[PDB]
Subunit: 105 residues, 2 copies
């Protein structure tokens, strides 16, 4: 499942739960075409990679976090581990998403 | 101004009319917050940099053009000159857009 981050303190909450695991955060928007296109594949990825934590952030609801992360288009995938930023992917490029999960898990 | 490309035939025509000028193409969508956010700044850029050709392509109307260019989120800026792809920018990052215009002008 892709758990939706409700706020900044729920955000930090989840990066701790994640412990040592790679964390993938989908920064998305409600009516966003590419976001809807990749969403089912991301759900599928979260169910097949149970040692990776998948989160999502509504940039309309969490402008705080989105601007903190200089999100410039949606979806943007942020890759994090132990609180550090490992990489980012701007856009719904499924194969690049797969490569980055493989590279960083 | 930022001229809206109507179809593939119009896209080729505008690229030809540009001669050897740099062409910057904004692939945008209607339901796209970041596209709206940068739209006025792109318009003002097209006025200041009158020796660069600025075009825009609505990816919902020109799906095959968007697919040909592997557009993965919006806005994406494609930089072209003499029929050659020079650069791509995924997202509404105004300072990056300025840097890439200067680099490729």
């Amino acid at each position: 499942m892709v758990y939706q981050v409700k706020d900044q303190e729920d955000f930090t909450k989840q990066l701790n739960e994640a412990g040592n695991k790679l964390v993938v955060i989908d920064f998305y928007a409600t009516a966003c075409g590419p976001c809807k296109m990749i969403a089912p594949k991301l759900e599928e990825l979260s169910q097949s990679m149970s040692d990776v934590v998948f989160l999502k952030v509504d940039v309309d609801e969490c402008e705080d976090i989105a601007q903190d992360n200089q999100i410039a288009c949606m979806p943007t995938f942020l890759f994090m581990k132990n609180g550090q930023k490992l990489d980012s992917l701007s856009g719904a490029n499924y194969d690049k998403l797969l490569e980055l999960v493989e590279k960083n898990k």
